[PDB]
From a paper:
To gain a better understanding for the molecular basis of this selectivity, we again turned to crystal structure analysis. Furthermore, the [name]-specific residue Gln1469 was involved in [name]: SMARCA2BD interactions, as previously observed for the [name]-selective molecule compound 5, albeit in this case in the context of a different overall arrangement of the two proteins. In summary, linker elongation with an oxygen and linker branching gave rise to compounds that were selective towards [name], a preference rationalised by ternary complex structures. However, despite good microsomal stability and measurable Caco-2 permeability, the compounds showed a high efflux ratio, preventing oral bioavailability. We observed higher selectivity for compounds from the ether series (e.g. compound 10) compared with ACBI2. Structurally, these compounds differ both in composition (e.g. ether vs. all carbon) and length.
We aimed to achieve orally bioavailable molecules that selectively degrade the BAF Chromatin Remodelling complex ATPase [name] over its closely related paralogue SMARCA4, to allow in vivo evaluation of the synthetic lethality concept of [name] dependency in SMARCA4-deficient cancers. Heterobifunctional molecules co-recruit a target protein and an E3 ligase, resulting in ubiquitylation and proteosome-dependent degradation of the target. We found that design of linker composition and exit vector placement could be guided and rationalised by ternary co-crystal structures, yielding molecules which exhibit high potency and suitable pharmacokinetic properties to translate to oral in vivo efficacy.
Author numbering:
A (entry chain C): 60 to 202
B (entry chain B): 17 to 47, 55 to 112
C (entry chain D): 1377 to 1489
D (entry chain A): 1 to 104
Write the structure that this text describes.
């Protein structure tokens, strides 16, 4: 069974998801079996109060490309119980991508996938362009 | 403490040593005159952009502030990707 | 109108096995299925699902002798699981939990002597 | 607030940072430490306009919003060879190739 999963606390926790990135954000909930599930997206520069539970696990991605994002400067967010009527903030931001990953993002945004192998670049980069970011491989790396 | 990174077309880029050490390849090249590295296949319009990346990485790594996007114009994207692949940064 | 007591006892034993099932993490998979989502919190559920049903309704239908056979009880449990698998996507927690519960129901019904 | 710059002369480009509150003369002191030429042997420019030593980088037009780490602002530099300053000359960087068909 996967180690990265939400705890079934059944204890409500109100969280403000703050999109402090220029990307449309996809919140991803890791369920009780450690499987990722998509939730409604957040436009850039918007904050929204949402209803979750203590010990639940969340990660955040670019909704269109699945590029990884940070939450409170780390990969995973776990709501805690609210104290003195205060919401918990999940501040979502861009990571400092490596230059290579940022270049791959830009090339993927400009060239259709069937045309990657027509680019005048070293062949090893075709596999890198095709190896699109995905939650499954990131969970494996984090585990 | 500065290093000089020289493009294929002879432009000399003077950057902080700690910023250049972002690249594992440059770290290996430094360990060419002392504190200087020549790049036979990286032209100046690309190497200048790599130096901007080093400044950006050092400024925003471990920062608690809102990080801006690192911009890449379409016309330099392929050459910058080749440089980043070679430089491992 | 009332069913033979043996039939009611059999219906309740099967449903109790489903409701009481706990997976290897100790989780009661049936819990979310006991009660339908409210119309105010999820009207989308009622717009898509033609015949909503939950375990509270199934238990009521056993108690009030609405089901006249184990086949009638199975039809509603299969409807509950079909609804869960219609509204919710494959791989979602609720869809996957309903697959397990369908299997628990089938095994429990088969073990009736 | 910090400003990120490229100080350029001929085929030399220095990447450095400073504050909007920094003065032009303070930038000449940065150049002196790197290129070993004193401030009185230097002229600094914004485009082709000579910057006054006593002005802040903010007073010259260098704002944090327009001099970012990822897109630094250019300051031109000219040196004094004996008694006269050379004309400002900044060699352009190389040109990118034409945008490929698969991007159009």
């Amino acid at each position: 069974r996967p180690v990265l999963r939400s705890v079934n606390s059944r204890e409500p926790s109100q969280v403000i998801f703050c999109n402090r990135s220029p990307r449309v954000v996809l919140p991803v909930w890791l369920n009780f079996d450690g499987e990722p599930q998509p939730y409604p997206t957040l436009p850039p520069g918007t904050g929204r109060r949402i209803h979750s539970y203590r010990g639940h696990l969340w990660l955040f991605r670019d909704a269109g490309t699945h590029d990884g994002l940070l939450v409170n400067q780390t990969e995973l967010f776990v709501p805690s119980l609210n104290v003195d009527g205060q919401p918990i903030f999940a501040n979502i931001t861009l990571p400092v991508y490596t230059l290579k990953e940022r270049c791959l993002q830009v090339v993927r945004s400009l060239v259709k996938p069937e045309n990657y192998r027509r680019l005048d670049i070293v062949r090893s980069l075709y596999e890198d362009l095709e190896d699109h970011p995905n939650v499954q491989k990131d969970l494996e790396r984090l585990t | 403490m500065y290093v000089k990174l020289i493009s294929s077309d002879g432009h000399e880029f003077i950057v902080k040593r700690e910023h250049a050490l972002t690249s594992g390849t440059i770290k290996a090249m430094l360990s060419n005159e002392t504190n200087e590295v020549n790049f036979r296949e990286i032209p100046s319009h690309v190497l200048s952009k790599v130096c901007m990346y080093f400044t950006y990485k050092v400024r925003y790594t471990n920062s608690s502030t809102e990080i801006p996007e690192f911009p890449i114009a379409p016309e330099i994207a392929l050459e910058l990707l080749m440089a980043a692949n070679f430089l491992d940064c | 109108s009332p069913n033979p007591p043996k039939l009611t006892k059999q219906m309740n034993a099967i449903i109790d096995t489903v409701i009481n099932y706990k997976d290897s993490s100790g989780r009661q998979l049936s819990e979310v299925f006991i009660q339908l989502p409210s119309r105010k919190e999820l009207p989308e559920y009622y717009e898509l699902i033609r015949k909503p049903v939950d375990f509270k309704k199934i238990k009521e239908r056993i108690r009030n002798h609405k089901y006249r056979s184990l086949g009638d009880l199975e039809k509603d449990v299969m409807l509950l699981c079909h609804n869960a698998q219609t509204f919710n996507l494959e791989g979602s927690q609720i869809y996957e939990d309903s697959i397990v519960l369908q299997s628990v129901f089938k095994s429990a019904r088969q073990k009736i002597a | 607030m910090d400003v990120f710059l490229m100080i350029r002369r001929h085929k030399t480009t220095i990447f450095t940072d400073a504050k909007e509150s920094s003065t032009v003369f303070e930038l000449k002191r940065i150049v002196e430490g790197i290129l070993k030429r004193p401030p009185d042997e230097q002229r600094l420019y914004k485009d082709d306009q000579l910057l006054d030593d006593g002005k802040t980088l903010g007073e010259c037009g260098f704002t944090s919003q327009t001099a970012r780490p990822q897109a630094p602002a250019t300051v031109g530099l000219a040196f004094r060879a004996d008694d006269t300053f050379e004309a400002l000359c900044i060699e352009p960087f190389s040109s990118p190739p034409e945008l490929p068909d698969v991007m159009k």
